[PDB]
C-alpha cells in the first residue's frame, strides 16, 4: 500500500514510499549482520567496471539462508518480518526449535507466529521448502535452486515467483519470472508461495536525491558526450544517433542478442522469454 505525499515541495508531488506495515522488528539480528563492503563499481584493479555507482547510504548485510535443506524436518517459528536494504524483498526472522536463528526472504502472506519447515515431507503451505519433485504441478513457488545443493538462485525479488508446469524424468518445468520455460532438476529446493512486498514496483523515487541514496550516480547519455567518449558523441547542435545505436564500447544496443550460442544450458531452456 504505497504511501503518497502532498505537494508541499516540488519533489513531494510524486514521491511514493513503501508502507512498511508488514514490518514487525526495526533493528536487525546482531548475530546475523556483517559489514557490506561498498565497491563504487570498482574491481580489484581499482578500475570502475560498472559506471555510475557509489555514494549510497551505509548498509549491513543480513546473512540469508538460501539452502534450507540445511535443516530438514526441524520446524521453525516466524518471529519477525524485517526490512533488508540489500534486496527488494522483505525478510523474515526464523526461530528454529533448535534454538538456531536464521533469515529467509519473506513470501507473500507469511505471518508472524506461524511455523515453516523444509524437506520432502513438508506440507504445501506458504513458506515451506521442498525439493521441486514433491511440489504438486501448478504450485506458485519462489526462491528456487537452479542446481541441486547450489543455493536458491531464481525468483528472489519482491513480488516475483516461478510456477511449476510439469515434470519430465528427473526434471521439473518452471515458468520463470521472465516467462522463460526451463527444465530445473527435481532435487532442487524451492519455497511455496510468491515473494512478498509486491507493491515494490509502484514506488516513484520522486527526486534526483533519492537515487543518490540508493548509490546510483547520474547517468550520462552517450549523445551528450564527444567522439572520444562514445559512438553517439559529437555533432553540431543536437544530433540523431546517425548510425545503429551503440553502447560506449561500440556494440549494438537495440536488438543485438548476446547470450552465448554454444552454452550447455541451452538443452534445458524450453522457450525464451516473451514481452
Tell me which residues in 59-98 interact with Mg ion (CB under 5 A): 83-84, 90
3-state secondary structure of 152: strand
Strand ranges (E), the chain: 3-4, 16-17, 33-35, 60-62, 76-82, 91-96, 101-105, 115-116, 129-131, 140-142, 144-145, 152-154, 162-168, 171-175, 181-185, 189-192, 269-271
DSSP tag of 127: T
Q: Is 22 in the site for Mg ion (CB under 5 A)?
A: yes
The partner in contact with residue 185, picked from Mg ion, RNA, none with C-beta cut-offs of 5 to 8 angstroms by kind, is Mg ion
Segment interacting with Mg ion (CB under 5 A) among 93-101, 104-112, 122-130, 266-274: 266-274
The stretch among 62-70, 94-102, 127-135, 239-247 that binds Mg ion (CB under 5 A) is: 239-247
Does position 214 interact with Mg ion (CB under 5 A)? The reply is yes
**x/- map, 172-211, Mg ion, by CB under 5 A:** --------x----x---------------x----------
Query: What whole-number distance in Å separates Cα of residue 126 and Cα of residue 171?
Result: 22
Task: Calculate the alpha carbon distances from 93 to 23, 96, 167 in Å.
Answer: 11, 10, 33
4 binds, among RNA, Mg ion, none (CB under 5 to 8 A by kind): Mg ion
Q: How far is CA 204 from CA 18, 28, 56, 93, 269, in A?
A: 10, 26, 18, 28, 34
> Is there binding between residue 5 and Mg ion (CB under 5 A)?
yes
Contact positions vs Mg ion (CB under 5 A): 4-5, 15, 20, 22-23, 30, 39, 41, 44, 48, 50-51, 53, 56-57, 83-84, 90, 147, 180, 185, 201, 214, 219, 221, 224, 235, 237, 239-240, 242-244, 246, 272-273
Amino acid at each position: 500500500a504505497v504511501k503518497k505525499f502532498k505537494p508541499y515541495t516540488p519533489s513531494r508531488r510524486f514521491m511514493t514510499v513503501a508502507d512498511f506495515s508488514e514490518i514487525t522488528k526495526t533493528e536487525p539480528e546482531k548475530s546475523l549482520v556483517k559489514p557490506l563492503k561498498k565497491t563504487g563499481g570498482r574491481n580489484n584493479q581499482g578500475r570502475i567496471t560498472v559506471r555510475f555507482r557509489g555514494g549510497g547510504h551505509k548498509r549491513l548485510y543480513r546473512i540469508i539462508d538460501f539452502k534450507r535443506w540445511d535443516k530438514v524436518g526441524i520446524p521453525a517459528k516466524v518471529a519477525a518480518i524485517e526490512y533488508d536494504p540489500n534486496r527488494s524483498a522483505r525478510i523474515a526472522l526464523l526461530h528454529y526449535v533448535d534454538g538456531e536463528k536464521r533469515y529467509i526472504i519473506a513470501p507473500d502472506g507469511l505471518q508472524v507466529g506461524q511455523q515453516v519447515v523444509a524437506g520432502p515431507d513438508a506440507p504445501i503451505q506458504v513458506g515451506n521448502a521442498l525439493p521441486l519433485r514433491f511440489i504438486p504441478v501448478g504450485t506458485v513457488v519462489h526462491a528456487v535452486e537452479l542446481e541441486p545443493k547450489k543455493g536458491a538462485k531464481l525468483a528472489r525479488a519482491a513480488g516475483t515467483s516461478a510456477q511449476i508446469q510439469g515434470r519430465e524424468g528427473d526434471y521439473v518445468i518452471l515458468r520463470l519470472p521472465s516467462g522463460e520455460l526451463r527444465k530445473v532438476h527435481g532435487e532442487c529446493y524451492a519455497t511455496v508461495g510468491a515473494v512478498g512486498n509486491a507493491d515494490h514496483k509502484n514506488i516513484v523515487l520522486g527526486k534526483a536525491g533519492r537515487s543518490r541514496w540508493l548509490g546510483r550516480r547520474p547517468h550520462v547519455r552517450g549523445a551528450a558526450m564527444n567522439p572520444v567518449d562514445h559512438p553517439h558523441g559529437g555533432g553540431e547542435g543536437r544530433a540523431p544517433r546517425g548510425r545503429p545505436p551503440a553502447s560506449p564500447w561500440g556494440w549494438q544496443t537495440k536488438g543485438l542478442k548476446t547470450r552465448k550460442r554454444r552454452k550447455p544450458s541451452s538443452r534445458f531452456i524450453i522457450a525464451r522469454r516473451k514481452k
